[PDB]
């Protein structure tokens, strides 16, 4: 609307898109570590054997 609130409601949808996109790009930085253990436990037989 160009009024004082409809300038602001734009900014609230920007911060969500920013902090939605900051999480999922960081998720592959976390999904990398989760991809370690489920193929390192394809190998690595136990120490007792």
Partner 1 sequence: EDTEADVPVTYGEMVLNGANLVTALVMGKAVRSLDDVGRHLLDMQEE
- If the CB atoms of residues 3 and 32 are measured against partner 1, the closer one turns out to be 3
What is the binding site for partner 1 (CB under 8 A)? 3-5, 8
- In terms of phi and psi (left: phi > 0; alpha: psi -120 to 50; beta: otherwise), the region of 6 is alpha
- If the CB atoms of residues 3 and 16 are measured against partner 1, the closer one turns out to be 3
Q: Based on C-alpha coordinates, what's the Rg of the chain?
A: 22
Main-chain dihedrals φ then ψ at residue 6, nearest 5 degrees: -80, -15
Q: How far is the CB of 27 from partner 1 (least distance, A)?
A: 32
- If the CB atoms of residues 8 and 43 are measured against partner 1, the closer one turns out to be 8
């Amino acid at each position: 609307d160009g009024t004082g609130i409809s300038l602001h409601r734009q900014l609230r949808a920007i911060q969500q898109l920013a902090r939605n996109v900051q999480a999922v790009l960081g998720a592959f930085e976390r999904g990398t570590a989760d991809q370690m253990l489920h193929v390192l436990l394809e190998k690595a037989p136990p120490l007792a054997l």
